[PDB]
Amino acid sequence: YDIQAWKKQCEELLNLIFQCEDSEPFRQPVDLLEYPDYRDIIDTPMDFATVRETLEAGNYESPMELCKDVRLIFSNSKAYTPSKRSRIYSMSLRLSAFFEEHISSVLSDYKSALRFHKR
Ligand SMILES: c1ccc(Cn2ccnc2)cc1
Structure with a gap:
């Protein structure tokens, strides 16, 4: 029933993702010199360094908001x-499966803690 526990759980999961070889293409924004038409196709760029900085700035209120930005990394790849x-x-599909496997309990614990606070 700890309403704050999700933040350190998400820091530790980001650490595992940065250590994974499959995260290499997603650790920084897509380079527009390498991919000159990128912004014609992708309206909202996203990457794991931006998600980590957003968390550390205190600019996520819940793990659902973090989860929406990480899923945008994968939908932009597709x-x-x-x-x-x-x-x-193919790297994005394996990293998506790994992320979804680990974030489900973070989400469940947070939503259970909020229900207990409002009981
Ligand atoms: C496939 C999917 C996405 C891209 C663009 N990109 C490059 C690095 N990270 C994403 C290239 C090919």
């Missing part, structure tokens, strides 16, 4: 890929 078989897209 929208930019030329093929469902591409290397960077």
Whole structure:
């Protein structure tokens, strides 16, 4: 029933993601010199360094808001890929499965703690 516990749980999960080789393409914003038409296709760029800085600034109120930005990293990968078989897209699908496996208990514990506070 700790309403604040999600923040350190999300810091530790970001640490595991940065250590994962599959996160390499997603650790910084997409480079617009490497991909000159990027912003014609992607309206809201997102990356793991931006999510980590947003958390450390105190600019997420819940783990649901963090989860929405991490899912945007993966939906941007799917929208930019030329093929469902591409290397960077295949890295995003494995990292998405790993993220979803670990975030479900963070979300459940937070929502349970808020229900207990309002009982
Ligand atoms: C597939 C999916 C996405 C991209 C763009 N991009 C490059 C690095 N991280 C994302 C390239 C190919």
